[PDB]
Coordinates of C-alpha atoms and ligand atoms in Angstrom, one line a residue:
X1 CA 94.9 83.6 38.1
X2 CA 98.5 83.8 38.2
X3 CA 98.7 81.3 40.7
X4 CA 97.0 78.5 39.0
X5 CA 99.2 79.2 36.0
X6 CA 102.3 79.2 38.4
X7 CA 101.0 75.8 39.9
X8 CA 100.6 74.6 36.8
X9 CA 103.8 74.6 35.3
X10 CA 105.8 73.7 38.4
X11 CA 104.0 70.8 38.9
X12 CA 104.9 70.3 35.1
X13 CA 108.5 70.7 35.5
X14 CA 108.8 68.5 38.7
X15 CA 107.3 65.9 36.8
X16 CA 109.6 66.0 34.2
X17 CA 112.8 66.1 36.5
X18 CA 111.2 62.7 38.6
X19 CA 111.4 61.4 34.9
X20 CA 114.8 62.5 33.9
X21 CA 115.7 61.8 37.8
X22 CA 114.4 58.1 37.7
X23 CA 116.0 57.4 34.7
X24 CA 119.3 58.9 35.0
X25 CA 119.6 56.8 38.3
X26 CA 118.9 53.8 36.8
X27 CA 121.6 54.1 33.9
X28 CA 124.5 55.0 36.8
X29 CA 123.0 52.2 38.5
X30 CA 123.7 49.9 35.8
X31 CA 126.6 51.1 35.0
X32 CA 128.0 51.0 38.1
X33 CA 127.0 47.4 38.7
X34 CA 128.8 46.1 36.0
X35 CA 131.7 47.1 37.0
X36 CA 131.2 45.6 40.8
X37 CA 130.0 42.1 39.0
X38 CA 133.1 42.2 37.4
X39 CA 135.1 42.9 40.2
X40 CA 133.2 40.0 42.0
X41 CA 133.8 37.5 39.1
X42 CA 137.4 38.0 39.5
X43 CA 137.3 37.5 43.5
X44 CA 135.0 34.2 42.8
X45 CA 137.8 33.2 40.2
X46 CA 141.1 33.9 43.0
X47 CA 139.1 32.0 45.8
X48 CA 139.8 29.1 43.9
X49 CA 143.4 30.1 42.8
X50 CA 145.6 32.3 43.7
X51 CA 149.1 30.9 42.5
X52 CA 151.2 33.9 41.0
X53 CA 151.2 32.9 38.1
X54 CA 147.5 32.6 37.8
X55 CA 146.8 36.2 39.7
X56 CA 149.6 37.9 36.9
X57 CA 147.5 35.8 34.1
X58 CA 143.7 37.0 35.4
X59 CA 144.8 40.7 36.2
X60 CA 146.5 40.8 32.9
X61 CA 142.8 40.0 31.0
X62 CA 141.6 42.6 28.6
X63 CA 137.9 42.8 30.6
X64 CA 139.7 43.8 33.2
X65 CA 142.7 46.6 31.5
X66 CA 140.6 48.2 29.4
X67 CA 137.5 48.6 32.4
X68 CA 139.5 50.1 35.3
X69 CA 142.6 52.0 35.1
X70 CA 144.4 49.4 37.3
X71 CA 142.9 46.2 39.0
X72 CA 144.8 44.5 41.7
X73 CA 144.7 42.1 44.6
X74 CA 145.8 43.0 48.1
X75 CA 146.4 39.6 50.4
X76 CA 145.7 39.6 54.0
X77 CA 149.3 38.8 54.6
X78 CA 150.0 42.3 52.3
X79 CA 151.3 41.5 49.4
X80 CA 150.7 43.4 46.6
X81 CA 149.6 42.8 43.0
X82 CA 148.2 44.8 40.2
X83 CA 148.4 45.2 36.6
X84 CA 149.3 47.6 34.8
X85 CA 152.5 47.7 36.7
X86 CA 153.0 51.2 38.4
X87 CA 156.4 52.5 40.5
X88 CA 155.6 51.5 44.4
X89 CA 156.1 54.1 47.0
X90 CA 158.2 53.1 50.3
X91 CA 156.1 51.7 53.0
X92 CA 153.2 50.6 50.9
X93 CA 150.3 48.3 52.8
X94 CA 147.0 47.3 51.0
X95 CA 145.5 46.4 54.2
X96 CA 145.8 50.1 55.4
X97 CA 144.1 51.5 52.1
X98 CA 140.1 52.4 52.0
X99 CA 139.5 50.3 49.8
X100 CA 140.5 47.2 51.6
X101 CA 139.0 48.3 54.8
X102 CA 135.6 48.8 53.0
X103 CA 135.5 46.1 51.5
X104 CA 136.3 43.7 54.5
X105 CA 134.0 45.9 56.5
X106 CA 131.1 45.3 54.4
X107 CA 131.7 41.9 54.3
X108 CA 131.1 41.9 50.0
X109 CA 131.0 44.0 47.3
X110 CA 131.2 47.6 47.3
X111 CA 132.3 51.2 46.5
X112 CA 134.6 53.7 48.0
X113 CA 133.6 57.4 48.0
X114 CA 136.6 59.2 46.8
X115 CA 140.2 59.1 48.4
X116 CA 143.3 60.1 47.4
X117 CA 145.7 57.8 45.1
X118 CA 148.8 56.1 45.9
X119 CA 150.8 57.4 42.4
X120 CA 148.4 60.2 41.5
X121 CA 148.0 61.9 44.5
X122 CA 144.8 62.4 43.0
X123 CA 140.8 61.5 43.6
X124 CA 139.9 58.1 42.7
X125 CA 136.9 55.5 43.3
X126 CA 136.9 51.9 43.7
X127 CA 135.1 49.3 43.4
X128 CA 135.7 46.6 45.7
X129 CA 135.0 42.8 47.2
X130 CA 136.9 40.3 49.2
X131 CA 138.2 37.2 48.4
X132 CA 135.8 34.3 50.1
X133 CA 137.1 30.6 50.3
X134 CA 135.8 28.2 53.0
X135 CA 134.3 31.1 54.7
X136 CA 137.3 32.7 55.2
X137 CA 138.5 35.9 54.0
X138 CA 141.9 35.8 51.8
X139 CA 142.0 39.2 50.9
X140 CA 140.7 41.9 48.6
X141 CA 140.0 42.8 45.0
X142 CA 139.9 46.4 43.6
X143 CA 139.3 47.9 40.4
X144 CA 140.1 51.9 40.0
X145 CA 137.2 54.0 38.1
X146 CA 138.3 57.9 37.6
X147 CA 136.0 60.4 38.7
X148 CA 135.8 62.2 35.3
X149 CA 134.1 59.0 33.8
X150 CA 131.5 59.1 36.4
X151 CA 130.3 62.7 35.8
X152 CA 130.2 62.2 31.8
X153 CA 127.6 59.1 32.3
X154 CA 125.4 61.1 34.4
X155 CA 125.2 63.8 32.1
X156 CA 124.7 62.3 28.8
X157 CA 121.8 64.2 28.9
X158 CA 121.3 68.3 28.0
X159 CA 118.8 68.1 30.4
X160 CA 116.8 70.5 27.4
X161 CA 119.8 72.7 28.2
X162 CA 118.0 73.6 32.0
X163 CA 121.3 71.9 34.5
X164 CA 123.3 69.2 35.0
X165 CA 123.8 66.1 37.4
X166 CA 126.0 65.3 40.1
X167 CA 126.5 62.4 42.4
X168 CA 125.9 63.2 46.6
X169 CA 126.1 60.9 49.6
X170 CA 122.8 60.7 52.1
X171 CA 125.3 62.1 54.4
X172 CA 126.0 65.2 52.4
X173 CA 129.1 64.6 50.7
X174 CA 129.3 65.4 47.0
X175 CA 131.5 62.5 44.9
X176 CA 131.3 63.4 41.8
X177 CA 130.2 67.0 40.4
X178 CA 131.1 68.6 36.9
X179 CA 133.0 71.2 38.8
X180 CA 136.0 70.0 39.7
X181 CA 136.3 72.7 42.6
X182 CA 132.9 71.4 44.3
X183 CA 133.9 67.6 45.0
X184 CA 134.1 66.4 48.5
X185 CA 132.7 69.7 49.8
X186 CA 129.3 69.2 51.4
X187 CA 126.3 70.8 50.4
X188 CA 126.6 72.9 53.3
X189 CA 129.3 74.2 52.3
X190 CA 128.6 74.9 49.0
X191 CA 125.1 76.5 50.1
X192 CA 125.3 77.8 53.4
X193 CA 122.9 80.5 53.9
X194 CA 119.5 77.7 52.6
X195 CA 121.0 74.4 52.1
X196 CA 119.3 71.7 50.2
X197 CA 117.4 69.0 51.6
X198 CA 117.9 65.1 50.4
X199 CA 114.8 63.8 51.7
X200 CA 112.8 66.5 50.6
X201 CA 111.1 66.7 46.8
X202 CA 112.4 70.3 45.4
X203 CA 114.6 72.3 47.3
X204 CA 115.3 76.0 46.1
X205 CA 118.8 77.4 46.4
X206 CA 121.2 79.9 45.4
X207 CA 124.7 79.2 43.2
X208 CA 126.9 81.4 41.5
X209 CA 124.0 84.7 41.5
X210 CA 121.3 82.5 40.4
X211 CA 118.2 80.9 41.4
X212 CA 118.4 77.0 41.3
X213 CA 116.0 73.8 41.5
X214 CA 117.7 70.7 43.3
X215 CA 115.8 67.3 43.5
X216 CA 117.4 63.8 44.7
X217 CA 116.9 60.2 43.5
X218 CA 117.7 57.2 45.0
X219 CA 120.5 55.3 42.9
X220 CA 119.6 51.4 44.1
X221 CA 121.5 48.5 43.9
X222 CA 124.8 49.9 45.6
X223 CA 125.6 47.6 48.5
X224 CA 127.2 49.6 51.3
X225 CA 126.5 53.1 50.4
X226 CA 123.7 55.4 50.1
X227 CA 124.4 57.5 47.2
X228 CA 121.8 60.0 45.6
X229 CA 121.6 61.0 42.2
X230 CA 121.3 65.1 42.1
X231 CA 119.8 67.4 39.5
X232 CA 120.3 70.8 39.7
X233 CA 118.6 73.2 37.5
X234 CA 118.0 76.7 36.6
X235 CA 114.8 77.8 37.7
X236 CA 114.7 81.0 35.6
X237 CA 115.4 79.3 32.4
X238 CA 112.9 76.5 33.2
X239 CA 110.1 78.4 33.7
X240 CA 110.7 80.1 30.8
X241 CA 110.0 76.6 29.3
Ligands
LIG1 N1 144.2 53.0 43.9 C1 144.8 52.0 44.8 C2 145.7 51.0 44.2 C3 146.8 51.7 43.4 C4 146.7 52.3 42.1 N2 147.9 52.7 41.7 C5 148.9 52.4 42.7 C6 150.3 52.6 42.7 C7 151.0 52.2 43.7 C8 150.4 51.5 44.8 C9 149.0 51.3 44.8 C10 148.2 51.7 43.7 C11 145.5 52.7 46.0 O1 145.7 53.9 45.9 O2 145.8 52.2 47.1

Protein backbone atom coordinates (compact mmCIF):
# COMPACT_ATOMS: atom_id res chain seq x y z
CA UNK A 1 0.00 0.00 0.00
CA UNK A 2 1.04 3.38 -1.06
CA UNK A 3 -0.76 4.90 1.66
CA UNK A 4 0.89 3.27 4.56
CA UNK A 5 4.21 4.08 2.96
CA UNK A 6 2.88 7.76 2.45
CA UNK A 7 1.78 7.75 6.25
CA UNK A 8 4.82 6.53 7.11
CA UNK A 9 7.22 8.96 6.05
CA UNK A 10 5.06 12.03 6.84
CA UNK A 11 4.67 11.09 10.17
CA UNK A 12 8.56 10.78 9.96
CA UNK A 13 9.23 14.13 8.66
CA UNK A 14 6.80 15.85 11.13
CA UNK A 15 8.67 14.32 13.81
CA UNK A 16 11.75 15.59 12.82
CA UNK A 17 10.53 19.25 12.22
CA UNK A 18 8.77 19.14 16.16
CA UNK A 19 12.53 18.39 16.80
CA UNK A 20 14.26 20.93 14.81
CA UNK A 21 11.04 23.24 15.83
CA UNK A 22 11.57 22.70 19.67
CA UNK A 23 14.99 23.33 19.54
CA UNK A 24 15.34 26.19 17.26
CA UNK A 25 12.77 27.98 19.73
CA UNK A 26 14.60 27.37 22.50
CA UNK A 27 18.06 28.85 21.23
CA UNK A 28 16.01 32.26 20.07
CA UNK A 29 14.58 32.00 23.29
CA UNK A 30 17.79 32.18 24.93
CA UNK A 31 19.18 34.36 22.98
CA UNK A 32 16.69 36.68 23.21
CA UNK A 33 16.53 36.69 26.96
CA UNK A 34 19.94 37.69 27.41
CA UNK A 35 19.66 40.48 25.83
CA UNK A 36 16.25 41.55 27.93
CA UNK A 37 18.26 40.53 31.39
CA UNK A 38 20.65 42.84 30.30
CA UNK A 39 18.50 45.49 29.49
CA UNK A 40 16.89 44.84 32.93
CA UNK A 41 20.26 44.94 34.89
CA UNK A 42 20.87 48.31 33.57
CA UNK A 43 17.24 49.63 34.58
CA UNK A 44 17.82 47.91 38.21
CA UNK A 45 21.38 49.79 38.13
CA UNK A 46 19.60 53.67 36.97
CA UNK A 47 16.81 53.12 39.71
CA UNK A 48 19.36 53.70 42.08
CA UNK A 49 21.25 56.44 40.06
CA UNK A 50 20.59 58.37 37.57
CA UNK A 51 23.02 61.45 37.86
CA UNK A 52 24.43 62.31 34.23
CA UNK A 53 27.40 61.55 34.80
CA UNK A 54 26.60 58.06 35.98
CA UNK A 55 23.90 57.34 32.96
CA UNK A 56 27.03 58.69 30.26
CA UNK A 57 29.38 56.21 32.40
CA UNK A 58 26.79 52.93 32.35
CA UNK A 59 25.63 53.46 28.64
CA UNK A 60 29.18 53.91 27.71
CA UNK A 61 30.03 50.01 29.18
CA UNK A 62 31.36 47.68 26.65
CA UNK A 63 28.33 44.91 27.63
CA UNK A 64 26.25 47.16 26.53
CA UNK A 65 28.14 48.83 22.93
CA UNK A 66 29.17 45.91 21.59
CA UNK A 67 25.31 43.96 22.36
CA UNK A 68 22.96 46.50 20.85
CA UNK A 69 23.65 48.91 18.19
CA UNK A 70 22.70 51.85 20.57
CA UNK A 71 21.34 51.69 24.25
CA UNK A 72 19.69 54.63 25.72
CA UNK A 73 17.43 55.97 28.44
CA UNK A 74 14.40 58.03 27.78
CA UNK A 75 13.08 59.95 31.20
CA UNK A 76 9.56 60.61 31.90
CA UNK A 77 10.24 64.21 31.79
CA UNK A 78 11.84 63.48 28.03
CA UNK A 79 15.10 63.82 28.11
CA UNK A 80 17.18 61.97 26.00
CA UNK A 81 20.29 59.78 26.37
CA UNK A 82 22.03 57.22 24.44
CA UNK A 83 25.45 56.13 23.50
CA UNK A 84 26.91 55.88 20.78
CA UNK A 85 25.99 59.43 20.15
CA UNK A 86 23.85 59.79 16.89
CA UNK A 87 22.71 63.42 15.05
CA UNK A 88 19.04 64.20 16.73
CA UNK A 89 16.22 65.01 14.50
CA UNK A 90 13.97 68.30 15.29
CA UNK A 91 11.09 67.56 17.60
CA UNK A 92 12.39 64.38 19.03
CA UNK A 93 10.21 62.77 22.26
CA UNK A 94 11.12 59.33 23.76
CA UNK A 95 7.87 59.15 25.48
CA UNK A 96 6.10 59.19 21.97
CA UNK A 97 8.39 56.23 20.58
CA UNK A 98 7.12 52.29 20.69
CA UNK A 99 9.43 51.39 22.59
CA UNK A 100 8.69 53.54 25.51
CA UNK A 101 4.94 53.01 25.25
CA UNK A 102 5.57 49.22 25.41
CA UNK A 103 7.44 49.13 27.81
CA UNK A 104 5.35 51.26 30.32
CA UNK A 105 2.42 49.41 29.02
CA UNK A 106 3.56 46.18 30.01
CA UNK A 107 4.61 47.29 33.12
CA UNK A 108 8.40 45.32 32.69
CA UNK A 109 10.49 43.90 30.34
CA UNK A 110 9.80 43.38 26.87
CA UNK A 111 10.16 43.50 22.99
CA UNK A 112 8.86 45.64 20.27
CA UNK A 113 7.82 44.01 16.95
CA UNK A 114 9.46 46.01 14.30
CA UNK A 115 9.10 49.91 13.71
CA UNK A 116 10.76 52.20 11.90
CA UNK A 117 14.12 54.11 13.21
CA UNK A 118 14.59 57.52 14.23
CA UNK A 119 18.16 57.97 11.95
CA UNK A 120 17.75 54.91 9.75
CA UNK A 121 14.53 55.24 8.66
CA UNK A 122 14.85 51.69 8.69
CA UNK A 123 13.19 48.35 10.67
CA UNK A 124 14.49 47.91 14.04
CA UNK A 125 13.63 45.83 17.32
CA UNK A 126 13.96 46.69 20.89
CA UNK A 127 14.23 45.35 23.78
CA UNK A 128 12.81 47.27 26.53
CA UNK A 129 11.98 47.77 30.51
CA UNK A 130 11.26 50.74 32.75
CA UNK A 131 13.03 52.20 35.22
CA UNK A 132 11.29 51.13 38.88
CA UNK A 133 12.21 53.06 42.13
CA UNK A 134 9.81 53.23 45.09
CA UNK A 135 7.18 51.89 42.95
CA UNK A 136 7.33 54.48 40.68
CA UNK A 137 8.16 54.62 37.15
CA UNK A 138 11.26 57.03 36.12
CA UNK A 139 11.41 56.18 32.73
CA UNK A 140 12.62 53.71 30.22
CA UNK A 141 15.59 51.62 29.02
CA UNK A 142 16.12 50.43 25.35
CA UNK A 143 18.56 48.47 23.71
CA UNK A 144 18.39 48.34 19.60
CA UNK A 145 18.87 44.65 18.00
CA UNK A 146 18.80 44.71 13.92
CA UNK A 147 16.57 42.55 12.27
CA UNK A 148 19.34 40.86 10.09
CA UNK A 149 20.88 39.42 13.43
CA UNK A 150 17.67 37.87 14.27
CA UNK A 151 17.16 35.86 11.01
CA UNK A 152 20.88 34.54 11.03
CA UNK A 153 20.32 32.87 14.74
CA UNK A 154 17.29 31.10 13.63
CA UNK A 155 18.82 29.65 10.74
CA UNK A 156 22.04 28.39 11.87
CA UNK A 157 20.67 25.33 10.76
CA UNK A 158 20.55 23.84 6.86
CA UNK A 159 17.60 22.40 7.97
CA UNK A 160 19.26 19.03 5.76
CA UNK A 161 19.03 21.65 3.06
CA UNK A 162 14.74 21.17 3.15
CA UNK A 163 13.78 25.34 4.24
CA UNK A 164 14.39 27.84 6.42
CA UNK A 165 13.01 29.75 9.62
CA UNK A 166 11.34 32.86 10.20
CA UNK A 167 9.92 34.61 13.11
CA UNK A 168 5.67 35.36 13.10
CA UNK A 169 3.34 36.97 15.63
CA UNK A 170 0.13 34.83 17.02
CA UNK A 171 -1.60 37.63 15.31
CA UNK A 172 -0.12 37.05 11.92
CA UNK A 173 2.51 39.43 11.50
CA UNK A 174 5.89 38.21 10.22
CA UNK A 175 8.99 40.04 12.17
CA UNK A 176 11.70 38.66 10.93
CA UNK A 177 11.89 36.52 7.54
CA UNK A 178 15.15 35.86 5.33
CA UNK A 179 13.42 37.77 2.67
CA UNK A 180 13.73 41.02 3.13
CA UNK A 181 10.47 41.76 0.93
CA UNK A 182 8.14 39.46 3.18
CA UNK A 183 8.60 41.35 6.67
CA UNK A 184 5.64 42.98 8.28
CA UNK A 185 3.38 41.42 5.58
CA UNK A 186 0.95 38.96 7.18
CA UNK A 187 0.64 35.50 6.19
CA UNK A 188 -2.38 36.38 4.56
CA UNK A 189 -0.91 38.34 2.46
CA UNK A 190 1.75 36.40 1.50
CA UNK A 191 -0.57 33.28 0.93
CA UNK A 192 -3.93 34.30 0.12
CA UNK A 193 -5.59 31.75 -1.80
CA UNK A 194 -4.82 28.74 1.51
CA UNK A 195 -3.26 30.57 4.31
CA UNK A 196 -1.42 28.84 7.07
CA UNK A 197 -2.76 28.07 10.32
CA UNK A 198 -0.70 28.85 13.71
CA UNK A 199 -2.53 26.75 15.94
CA UNK A 200 -2.68 23.94 13.69
CA UNK A 201 0.26 21.13 13.45
CA UNK A 202 1.21 21.16 9.49
CA UNK A 203 -0.29 23.44 7.21
CA UNK A 204 0.27 23.02 3.32
CA UNK A 205 0.78 26.06 1.18
CA UNK A 206 1.88 27.41 -1.90
CA UNK A 207 5.16 30.02 -2.39
CA UNK A 208 6.96 31.08 -5.34
CA UNK A 209 5.38 27.84 -7.76
CA UNK A 210 6.09 25.37 -5.13
CA UNK A 211 4.56 23.13 -2.67
CA UNK A 212 5.51 23.96 0.96
CA UNK A 213 5.24 22.48 4.69
CA UNK A 214 4.75 25.26 7.43
CA UNK A 215 4.68 24.17 11.24
CA UNK A 216 4.74 26.77 14.31
CA UNK A 217 6.41 26.53 17.76
CA UNK A 218 5.87 28.41 20.66
CA UNK A 219 9.06 30.63 21.56
CA UNK A 220 8.45 30.92 25.64
CA UNK A 221 9.84 33.20 27.95
CA UNK A 222 9.01 36.53 26.02
CA UNK A 223 7.04 38.69 28.42
CA UNK A 224 4.44 40.68 26.51
CA UNK A 225 4.33 39.14 23.16
CA UNK A 226 3.31 35.98 21.61
CA UNK A 227 5.79 35.28 19.01
CA UNK A 228 6.01 31.81 17.08
CA UNK A 229 8.92 30.28 15.72
CA UNK A 230 8.03 29.21 11.83
CA UNK A 231 9.59 26.53 9.64
CA UNK A 232 8.80 26.45 6.25
CA UNK A 233 9.85 23.65 4.13
CA UNK A 234 9.81 22.16 0.71
CA UNK A 235 7.64 19.32 0.60
CA UNK A 236 8.81 17.88 -2.71
CA UNK A 237 12.40 17.85 -1.64
CA UNK A 238 11.49 16.31 1.78
CA UNK A 239 9.75 13.52 0.73
CA UNK A 240 12.31 12.83 -1.48
CA UNK A 241 14.26 12.34 1.88
N1 LIG B 1 15.76 53.25 18.05
C1 LIG B 1 15.23 54.26 18.97
C2 LIG B 1 16.35 55.10 19.59
C3 LIG B 1 17.30 55.72 18.60
C4 LIG B 1 18.27 55.08 17.87
N2 LIG B 1 18.94 55.99 17.08
C5 LIG B 1 18.43 57.24 17.29
C6 LIG B 1 18.79 58.48 16.72
C7 LIG B 1 18.09 59.59 17.12
C8 LIG B 1 17.05 59.50 18.07
C9 LIG B 1 16.70 58.27 18.65
C10 LIG B 1 17.39 57.12 18.25
C11 LIG B 1 14.21 55.15 18.26
O1 LIG B 1 14.13 55.09 17.04
O2 LIG B 1 13.44 55.91 18.88
Amino acid sequence: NDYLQRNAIREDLESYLREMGDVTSSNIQNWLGGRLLLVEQTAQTLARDHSPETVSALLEQPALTSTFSFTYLGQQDGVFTMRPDSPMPAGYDPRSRPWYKDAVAAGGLTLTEPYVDAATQELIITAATPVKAAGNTLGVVGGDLSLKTLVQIINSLDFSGMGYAFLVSGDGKILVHPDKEQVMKTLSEVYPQNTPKIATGFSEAELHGHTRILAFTPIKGLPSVTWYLALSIDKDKAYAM
